[PDB]
Write a protein that binds this ligand. Sequence first.
Ligand code: LW8
Length: 273
Amino acid sequence: KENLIIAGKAGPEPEILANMYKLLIEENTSMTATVKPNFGTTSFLYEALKKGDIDIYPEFTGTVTESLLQPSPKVSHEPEQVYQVARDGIAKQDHLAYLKPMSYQNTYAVAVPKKIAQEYGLKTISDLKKVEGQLKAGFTLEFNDREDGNKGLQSMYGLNLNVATMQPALRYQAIHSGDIQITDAYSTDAELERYDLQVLEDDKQLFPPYQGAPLMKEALLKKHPELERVLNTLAGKITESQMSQLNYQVGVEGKSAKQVAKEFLQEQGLLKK
Ligand SMILES: C[N+](C)(C)[C@@H](Cc1c[nH]c(=S)[nH]1)C(=O)O
């Protein structure tokens, strides 16, 4: 009875996904699983998977192509083609099996409050160049370090924003309290609707498609080939409205994310009872 270490990045959403994995593995295989919530950021999840410290983690397709793949391929904005380059690229580079993606897109999103976008005429990311000497931005450290992040805001848009580096769990409160007026939101985050935040349109298309999918070593899939069929029951499933409600239940209502993942997969017929 092997026990697989399933970890996630920071936030309720990868903890929900890791528990969804654990529920499907424990029911449909002879293995158990342990969920490591908020295990780290993208690179730490990536190097722990290659080092064998963790077994599965939900990785996003544009994050493979931009951060994990070196040199980064020039991909399209079609999510199926971004997945195919990410799956073939991460198998070529690090021998990691990238299973089939989910339906929803959880992208990076430049978000300002609803008052600020109407006060300053902000509708797209290019509109931040009008006002970049006025508002203060609060970004996560990884978004600052990423070429599909604040570095791409500098490179593709010309935006040299007044950026304060933030922890991920404190950026939504600070945009709510008014200490910052720009933050790196995630598309399926419940704090977008909870804090009246208006997502600015990616008019120059800096951000690639970002669909989540299980990422694991190829050797683990060769040892356990049932892991492919079991976890691909989530493939092409879970909408943006469904995932944002799961983040609302765990992150805001304080529900246990193993329970939140269990009721959802039972409601969709993906889990027993
Ligand atoms: C889904 N996403 C928005 C595209 C990001 C979110 C994220 C980046 N770093 C951490 S931690 N979370 C990612 O996982 O790459």
